[PDB]
Amino acid sequence: RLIPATLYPGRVILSLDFILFCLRLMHIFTISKTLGPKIIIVKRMMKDVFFFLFLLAVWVVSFGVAKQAILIHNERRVDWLFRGAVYHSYLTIFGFPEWLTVLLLCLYLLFTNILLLNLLIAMFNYTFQQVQEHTDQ
Amino acid sequence: FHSKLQKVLVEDPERPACAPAAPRLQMHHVAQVLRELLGDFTQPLYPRPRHVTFTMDPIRDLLIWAIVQNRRELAGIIWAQSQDCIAAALACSKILKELSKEEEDTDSSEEMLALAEEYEHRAIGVFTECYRKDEERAQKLLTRVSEAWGKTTCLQLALEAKDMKFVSHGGIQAFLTKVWWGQLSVDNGLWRVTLCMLAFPLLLTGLISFREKRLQDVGTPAARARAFFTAPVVVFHLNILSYFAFLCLFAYVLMVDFQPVPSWCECAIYLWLFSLVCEEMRQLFYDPDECGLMKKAALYFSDFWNKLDVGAILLFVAGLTCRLIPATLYPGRVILSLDFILFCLRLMHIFTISKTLGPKIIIVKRMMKDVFFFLFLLAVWVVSFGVAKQAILIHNERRVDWLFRGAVYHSYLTIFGFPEWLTVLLLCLYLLFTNILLLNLLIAMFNYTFQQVQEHTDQIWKFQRHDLIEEYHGRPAAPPPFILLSHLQLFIKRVVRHKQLKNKLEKNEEAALLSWEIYLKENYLQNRQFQQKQRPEQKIED
C-alpha cells in the first residue's frame, strides 16, 4: 500500500491479513474448560483435511469445465465466466440433446454431494475413534 | 495327500511304460505333488533321476512327511530341531493353508487351518527375537535364497500364503520403507523431496540428507543426483507430476485448440496416452517365473482400480474415432469430456500410498458397492417428486430440454444438501422425504458399516503396501516424456531381477548366519515353554 503504484493490491493483501488474524480467535477456546479438548482434536485433524480439500477442489473444477465445454463451441474470459461458475459452485458446495443434459447432471450430483460426503463421514468417525478417550490428559 | 499321490502315480507315463503291473512309487513323484501344493515359483524339492546317502537337510524331509498327515505333536517336536526355522515354519503354513481348502471334511479342515496359523506364530516368534538383537542382519535374513526350500525367499512365502500377521510385523515395514527411500536417507521429511526436485543446486546444496555419509560428506554431485534419481520415491513423484500436466494440458487442448483436423497438441496427447498405456501393459510380462498369462489376466480383471482404468481406455478408443468422423464431431466432444472426468477420478490413487489415509480409501472401496445401489433410489426419489410438481401445476407440458433441464437444475440446488393449501401440503411432504428420510438412512448406513470394519483394516493396508513398493522400485527410471526411448530400448530386446529383493550369499557368510539363527531359535523356545508355566489354569492343574 505504501507505494501508491501498489495501492489496490495493497487493499487485497491487507484484507487477507485481516482474515488471518480473525482466525487466531479460536484460541479463546483453548483455555475453554469445556471445549479445549475439541480444539486439540481438530488440531490433529488440520493436517489431513488440508490434503482432502485439495481433492474436492480439483473435483468440482473438473466438473465445471466439463459443463462449459459441453454447452459451447468456444469461450474465454474467466473474469465473468469462471467467476459466475465458481459462484454457482459455491452454491453447490454450500452442502433431443436433453438426454445428454440429464445424464451430465445426474453423474455430477452423483459424485459431488455423495462420494466425498460419506468419505469424510468415515474419515472423521475413524480418526475420532482413534483418539476419542485420553486427550483430556 | 495319499489320494493325490496315488493319482499322480498312475498318471505317470513312463511307469506303466516300464511295467503297468508294478507302479514303483518313485520319490520325485512326491516332489511333483509338493511343487503343485507349494507354488509354481519354487523348484522341485527332489531331483529326477535319469552305501547310504542322506540328502541336504534330512530333517526338513521328515518335517514334510509329518505335516501333510496332520500329525500335530510329531511336527512340533521335529521343527524344534530344524535347520533354518523361519523358512520352514513359513513353508508349512503355506502347505497347510493350501491343503485345508480341498479336504471335503469339516473337522479335519478346521484342525488343519488352526495348525497353519499356529506355525506363522512360530515364525513371528523367532523373527521378532532375532530382530530385537540385531537389525541389519535381521534384514539380511528376510531376503536370502534358501537353497533347501526350492530357491525361494522368506518374504515371498509370506506373501503367497497371506500371513498378514507376519508381513505386518513392523520390523518388516521398517525394511520396506528402507527400500522406499532407495538410496538416500529415510528421515528427511517429504517437502524437501519436492523442493530439491524443482531446483538442481538444492541437491548440490545442503538441504537434503543421505545415509552412508561416505557419499553425503564426500560429495560427487553428479553421481549424487544420479543416485537421487534412482530413489523410487522420486520416480513416483515424477510420475505424479507428468500425470498432472498431461491431464490439464489435455483439458486445454480440448477446450480451445479443439480443431476438426488433428491439432498439433491433440495428436501429441494421443501419443502420450499411448505411451502411458504402453508402460501399463509393460507391467504384465516382467514375470520372471513362468507365470500363467490367463491368471494374471484374471487378476487385473479383478482389480476394481484396474477396472476403472480399462473402462476409461475403452472410452477413449471409442470417442477418438467418433470425433475422427466429422459427421460425429459434436458427440465426439461430449464423449471425450466424459473420458476426461473418468481420468480425473483415478487421481484418488494418490492417497493409496498415503501414510495417513490409505486405510480410509480402503474403507470407501468397500463402500462403493452399496452406495451405488442407494444412489439409484434417491434418483428415482427426486424425479418422482419433480414430475409430481410439473403435473400438479399444469394441464399439459413437454420439452424436457428446458423444462426438465431447469427442473433438474432446481433439483441439483435441492440436492446440494384457495389452492395455496395444496401448495403448502406438497412442499411440506416433499421436504419431509428429501432431506430427512435418506439423510438419517445413510447416517445409519455409514455408522453401521463403519463399526463393521473400523479396527483391523490397517493390517490389510500394511499388507498391500508391498507390491506397490515392488513395482516402483522395479520400473525403469523414465517418466512418460522420456518413456518412449525406454519402451523402444525394451522392444529392441523384445525383438532380440534386482539385488534388492533376492540375492545368493556366500558359504562362509551364510553359515555364520544360520548358526546365529539356530542359537536364537533355541532361546525363543525356552521363553515360550517357560511362560507356559505361568498360565494360572495350568498352575491350578498342577
Collect all residues with Cβ–Cβ distance below 8 Å to A55 and sequence separation of at least 6.
A116, B347, B348, B351
Pick from B261, B250, B270: nearest CA to B324:
B261
Residue to mutate among A62, A91, A112, with most B CBs inside 10 A, is A62
Burial class of residue A113 in the structure, from the number of CB atoms within 10 Å of its CB (0-12 exposed, 13-18 middle, 19+ buried): middle
Are B233 and B193 spatial neighbours (Cβ–Cβ below 8 Å)?
A: yes
Are B465 and B226 spatial neighbours (Cβ–Cβ below 8 Å)?
A: no
**Is A97 in Cβ contact with B401 (below 8 Å)?**
yes
Of B344, B360, B450, the CB nearest to A58: B344
The residue type of B72 is R
The residue type of B482 is F
Q: Report CA dihedral (A9, A11, A12, A15) to the nearest 10 degrees.
A: 150
Q: What are phi and psi of B105, to 5 degrees?
A: -140, 140
Sign of the Cα pseudo-torsion (B66, B68, B73, B75, in order)? positive
DSSP assignment of B294-356: HHHHHHHHH-HHHHHHHHHHHHHHHHHHHHHSGGGHHHHHHHHHHHHHHHHHGGGGGGGS-TT
**Alpha carbon distance B362, B458 (integer Å):** 9
**Is A115 in Cβ contact with B371 (below 8 Å)?**
yes
For B400, the grid coordinates are 424436457
Question: Helix, strand, coil proportions of chain B in percent (round to 5)?
Answer: 70, 0, 30
Alpha-carbon B31 to chain mean position:
31
SS (H, E, C) A13-70: HHHHHHHHHHHHHHHHHHCCCCCHHHHHHHHHHHHHHHHHHHHHHHHHHHHHHHHHHH
Q: Which residue in chain B is spatially nearest to A123 when comparing CA positions?
A: B360
Burial class of residue B212 in the structure, from the number of CB atoms within 10 Å of its CB (0-12 exposed, 13-18 middle, 19+ buried): exposed
**Is B255 in Cβ contact with A115 (below 8 Å)?**
no
> For cell 455423495, what's the residue?
A114
**Alpha carbon distance B230, B498 (integer Å):** 13
Q: Which residues in chain A have their CB less than 8 angstroms from residue B442's CB?
A: 118
- Kindly report the nearest CA distance between residue A38 and chain B, in angstroms: 20
Are B359 and B461 spatial neighbours (Cβ–Cβ below 8 Å)?
A: yes
**Alpha carbon distance B442, B427 (integer Å):** 23
**Is B412 in Cβ contact with A58 (below 8 Å)?**
no
DSSP assignment of B240-298: HHHHHHHHHHHHHHHHTS--SS--HHHHHHHHHHHHHHHHHHHTTS---S---HHHHHH
Collect all residues with Cβ–Cβ distance below 8 Å to B200 and sequence separation of at least 6.
B225
**Alpha carbon distance B467, B159 (integer Å):** 10
Q: What angle do CA B524, B503, B293 make, to 5 degrees?
A: 105
**Is A105 in Cβ contact with B334 (below 8 Å)?**
no
Q: Which residues in chain B have their CB less than 8 angstroms from residue A58's CB?
A: 344, 347
Resolution of this entry, Å: 3.8
Are B86 and B121 spatial neighbours (Cβ–Cβ below 8 Å)?
A: no
Q: What are phi and psi of B152, to 5 degrees?
A: -95, -175
For B542, the grid coordinates are 498342577
**Alpha carbon distance B137, B404 (integer Å):** 70
- The neighbour count for residue B224, using CB atoms within 10 Å, is 19
Q: Which residue in chain B is spatially nearest to A90 when comparing CA positions?
A: B416
Q: What are phi and psi of A125, to 5 degrees?
A: -55, -40
**Is B450 in Cβ contact with A122 (below 8 Å)?**
yes
Are B122 and B92 spatial neighbours (Cβ–Cβ below 8 Å)?
A: no
Q: Which residues in chain A have their CB less than 8 angstroms from residue B417's CB?
A: 94-95, 113
Technique employed here was cryo-EM
Are B187 and B233 spatial neighbours (Cβ–Cβ below 8 Å)?
A: no
Q: Which residues in chain A have their CB less than 8 angstroms from residue B379's CB?
A: 106
B455 is in an annotated binding site: no
Collect all residues with Cβ–Cβ distance below 8 Å to B184 and sequence separation of at least 6.
B208, B209, B210, B211, B227, B228, B231
Chain breaks in chain A (C to N over 2.5 A) after: 95
Are B229 and B477 spatial neighbours (Cβ–Cβ below 8 Å)?
A: yes
**Is A106 in Cβ contact with B379 (below 8 Å)?**
yes
Could you tell me if residue B104 is left (phi over 0), alpha (psi between -120 and 50 degrees) or otherwise beta?
left
